[PDB]
Amino acid sequence: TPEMPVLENRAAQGDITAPGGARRLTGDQTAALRDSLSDKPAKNIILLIGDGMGDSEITAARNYAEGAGGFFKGIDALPLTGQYTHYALNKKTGKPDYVTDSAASATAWSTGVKTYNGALGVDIHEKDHPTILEMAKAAGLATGNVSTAELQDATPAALVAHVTSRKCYGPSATSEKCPGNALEKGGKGSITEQLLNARADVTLGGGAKTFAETATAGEWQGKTLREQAQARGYQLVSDAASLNSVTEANQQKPLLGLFADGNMPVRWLGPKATYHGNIDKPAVTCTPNPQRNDSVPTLAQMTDKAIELLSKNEKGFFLQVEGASIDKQDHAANPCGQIGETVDLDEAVQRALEFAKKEGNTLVIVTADHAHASQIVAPDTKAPGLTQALNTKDGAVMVMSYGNSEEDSQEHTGSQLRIAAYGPHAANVVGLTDQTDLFYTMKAALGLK
Amino acid sequence: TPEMPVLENRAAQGDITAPGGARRLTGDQTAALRDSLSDKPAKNIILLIGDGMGDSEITAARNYAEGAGGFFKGIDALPLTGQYTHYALNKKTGKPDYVTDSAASATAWSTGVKTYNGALGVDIHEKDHPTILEMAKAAGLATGNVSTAELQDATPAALVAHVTSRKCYGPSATSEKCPGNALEKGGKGSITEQLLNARADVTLGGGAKTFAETATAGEWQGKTLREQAQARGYQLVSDAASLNSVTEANQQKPLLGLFADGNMPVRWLGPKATYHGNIDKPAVTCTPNPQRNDSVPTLAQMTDKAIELLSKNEKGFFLQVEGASIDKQDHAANPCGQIGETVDLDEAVQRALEFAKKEGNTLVIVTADHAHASQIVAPDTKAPGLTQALNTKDGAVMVMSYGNSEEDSQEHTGSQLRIAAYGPHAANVVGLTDQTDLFYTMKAALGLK
Ligand SMILES: [Mg+2]
Ligand SMILES: [Mg+2]
Ligand SMILES: [Zn+2]
Ligand SMILES: [Zn+2]
Ligand SMILES: [Zn+2]
Ligand SMILES: [Zn+2]
Structure with a gap:
């Protein structure tokens, strides 16, 4: 009987100061790896994205929360790993633009085509390309889109919208920013409108604010996008209690969870990094956010509910889960927010892996859209930017630095970064790959045409 | 009949602006990965280290020299890849020190033990631990140590020396900085004296300057270390002609190549990055160093000759090859020097792979000791540090930033980084591992006790 193993433990095996105490392996890995290889078709796919989670963000998060010799039970447990490239294209020239934004990267793994910074679901010629979610739905698979950001944000929007600018959230920004996509100009509509038309079985996230807008044209002109949503049969949910109450989500009663106006709350708080903060200020210990809430589901809860609902579909499902705030907090130069959000993503990856290990036909993939700014530097570092000293689980201080913007x-930065996977077809993430190979790998694993 | 494949071509398959044109894969990778897995013993090991070559350095060099969609025929062709941690230890507390120097990291993979920054071949208690080279030689395998840095430098020295400070190059610095290791105090000697006692079959690099010092005690007291070398039967060689003339290197006539006084010359020139250099200055095109020479062997040449000489030993060989100046040019904030050194290492990795592919029992490993500073940022970036715009092979501009030191x-930085390998036992570099795991993997692969 054949089953695929997840690395159970890659923590330092003992005393890190002694010979062999810092090893993470306990014996040869060949047989374990041979057992991980399968070209059987995947019935399901769970894609987890940590926005801006390059290797440096994973290292900093691990050091702080599990200690240098620790191990993330989710993020570090996928057995097949590689590194992939995520460069975008300059719109005018069609030449590479080495540092991508969240919109062009999302489009690359969701459509299989490189695009310009700021585009969602269109190529450099502004032509629409079908997304993996749209294709999954067309083959009859269940589909989910979960994120801690506004659902209009680049990462979850890329699966359901095709607009020339990521800024075209609703009817008003679209009329002014994406005239050709404007509904009243004959277009498909703003991000939120196209999201409602896409009709994924499960959509969960923040972004309730934009649903307050009213349609400028169409069958539901004059009423709010929230109204249109209920009118078209969506089950609206807005706190954890309600979310748990849901027992079915499908094309007849697709689920839409709006848990916050903008982005959902961050897990941990801490002060912002400051100039010479590692020398001028005391070391920081992060503190849980008192307003993250018992009524706000966490990313792992959302992941679990999404899995429960989507797995009732015998055909299979595609689910994308995004740990959105790693990137945002990295932009904010806030080590604690950034680390808290990677820890949060780890819990969601654990849920996904538990399901996959037991189900057996699920491909789980964990990766990021692009790299980011934070660097782990020596404690006595005198840097030109923003720094902060943190008290890690080891009882030592780690200094983080943000020095790529005045x-x-x-x-963001352009370094290639880790991609890791588990399950049927995971072999296709090993070695060097491009972000657009991700689209083809997932399309082939599911057997879509 | 079973053979292990190297990735032949992972360059973008077509037009990067079109659907599927940026894909690096042409089909499912499962069978190919299954064919790369073997637990057969390794007869030989070639360990190639890019100093400071983290994922960011690899991406910057690929973008510049092969274009974003290109592919390093050496560096990117290894099929089994993972990420590994390299934290060092605080000497006093024994707790992790998140950002390692070149001395503690080389000690970790060459001994299997973590140590403090600055130590070579000793643990935090200053106890000596045998290296993979000393163990290989004890089992009767041929051994080689090649680098473009001074042979007294941390990376090549770690395989043959055990001193409490990497600064103890020769007799004089040792007397004052490593009193306990000083020969005239009863110690084993300075780095260069221990290198002469270790007697690897092939040692090639720079650092002839220190051999001008004279021993303070011992059998060869009063004469230069160069003189001692000839007295002990070493074949001294100092240019490429001489190097090519060598037809055998063994324990009777070990080879010592001193090609420069300090570090061997860098491949490419270019100006240093500067404050607001991407905005204030014109884009840079790197230029080949006129003084890199016809009489100075290149890293690939050194690698070839080392492989020819060490392969005559029927028992097998261990060879470590270091592209030293990537790290040094990264410190200097000089993009061209840094990229040129990465390109140079790629050529050496190509020679090692050709041999391995044909020999069939050689484990080739390519990785770095720690990550470094350079980041690839957006072209319009206003950063607090040193930046520079470069004209890449794609005909686009890429901006590089150095912003972690005033x-x-x-x-250096602490992000985990790429480790890739090919051949028997390569499966042990996949997933998350620690740098000390590398010592154990090599020892097992060669079957050493
Ligand atoms: Mg995002
Ligand atoms: Mg070095
Ligand atoms: Zn992003
Ligand atoms: Zn961002
Ligand atoms: Zn180094
Ligand atoms: Zn260095």
Whole structure:
């Protein structure tokens, strides 16, 4: 009998100061890896994205929360790993633009085509390309889209919308920013409108604010997008109690969970990094956010409910889960927010892996859209940017640095980064790959045409 | 009949602006990965280290020299990849020190034990631990140590020396900095004296300057370390002609190649990055160093000759090859020097792979000791540090940033980084591992006790 193993434990095996104490392996891995290889078709796919979660963000998060010799039971447990490229294209020239934003990267793994920074679901010629979610739905599979960001944000929107600018959230921004996509100009509609038309079985996230807008044209002109949603049969839910109450989500009663106006709350708080903060200020210990809430579902809860609902479909399902705030907090130069959000994503990955290990036909993939700014530097570092000293689980201090922008927001970077997977077809993430190979790998694993 | 494949081509398959044109894969990878898995013993090991070559350095060098959609025929062709941690230990507390130097990291993979920054071949208690080279030689395998840095430098020294400070290059620095290791105090000697005692079959690099010092005690007291070398039967060689003339290197006539006084010359020139250099200055095109020479062997040449000489030993061989200046040029904030050194290492990795593919029992490993400073940022970036715009092979501009030090030297960083391998036992680099796991993997692969 054949089953696929998840690395149970890759923590340092003992005393890190002694010979062999810092090893993470206990014996040869060949047989274990041979057992992980399967070209059987995947019935399901769970894609987990940590926005801005390059290797440096994973390392910093692990150091702080599990200690240097620790191990994330979710993020570090996928057995097949590689590194992939995520460069975008300059719209005018069609040449590579080395540092992507969240919109062009999302489109690349969701459509299989490179695009310009800011586009959602269209190529450099502004032509629409079908997404993996739309194709899944067309083959009759259940579909889910979960995120801690506004649902109009680049990452979850890329699966359901095709607009020339990521800024075209609702009817008003669209009329002014994406005229050709404007409903009243004959277009498909703003991000939110196209989201409602896409009709995924399960959509959960923040972004309730934009649903307050009213349609400028169409069958539901004059009424709010929230009204249109209920009118078209959506089960609206807005707190954890209600979310747990849901027992079925399907094309007849698709679920829409709006848990916050903008982005859902961050798990941990901490002060922002400051100039010479590692020398001028005391070390920081992060504190849980008192307003994250008992009534606000966490990403792992959302992941669990999404899995429960989507698995009732005998055909199979595609679910994308996004740990959205790693990137946002990285932009904010806030180590605690950033680390808390990676820890949060780890819990959702654990849920996904438990299901997959038991179900056996599920491909789980964990990766990021692009790299980000934070760097782990020596404690006595005198850097030109923003730094902060943190008290880690090891009882030592780790210094983090943000030094790629004099502006207010720290920027993305173009380093290739880790992709890891488990399950049927995971072999296709090993070695060097491109972000658009992700679209083809998932399309082939599910056997879509 | 079973053979293990190297990735032949992972360059973008077509037009990067079109659907599927940016894909690096042409079909399912399962069978190919299954064919790469073997637990057969390794007769030989080739360990290639890019100093400071984290994923960011690899991406920057690929973008510049092969284009974003290109592919390093050496660096990117290894089929089994993972990420590994390299934290060092605080000497006093024994707790993790998140950002390692080159001395503690080389000690970790060459001994299997974590140590403090600055130590070579000793643990935090200053106890000596045998290296993979010393163990290989004890089992009767041929051994080689090749680098473009001074042979007294941390990376190549770690295989043959055990001193409490990496600064103890020769007799004089040792007397004052490593009193306990000083020969005239009864110690084993300075780095260069221990290198002469270790007697690897092939040692090639820079660092002839220190051999001008004279021993303070011992059998060869009063004469230069160069003189001692000839007295002990070493074949001294100092240019490429001489290097090519060598037809055998063994324990009777070990080879010592001193090609420069300090570090061997860098491949490419270019100006240093500067404050607001991507906005204030024109884009840079790197230029081949006129003084890199016809009489100075290149890293690939050194690698070839080392492989020819060490392969005559029927028992097998261990060879470590270091592209040293990637890290050094990264510190200097000089993109061209840094990229040129990465390109240079790629050529050496290609020679090692050709041999391995044909020999069939060689484990080739390519990785770095720690990550470094350089980041690939957006072209319009206003950063607080040093930046520079480069004209890449794609005909687009890529901006590189160094923003983690207000000092003169750019600093190392602690992000986990790529490790890739090919051949028998390569499965042990996949997933998350620690740098000390690498010592154990090599020892097992060669079957050492
Ligand atoms: Mg996002
Ligand atoms: Mg070095
Ligand atoms: Zn992003
Ligand atoms: Zn971002
Ligand atoms: Zn180094
Ligand atoms: Zn260095």
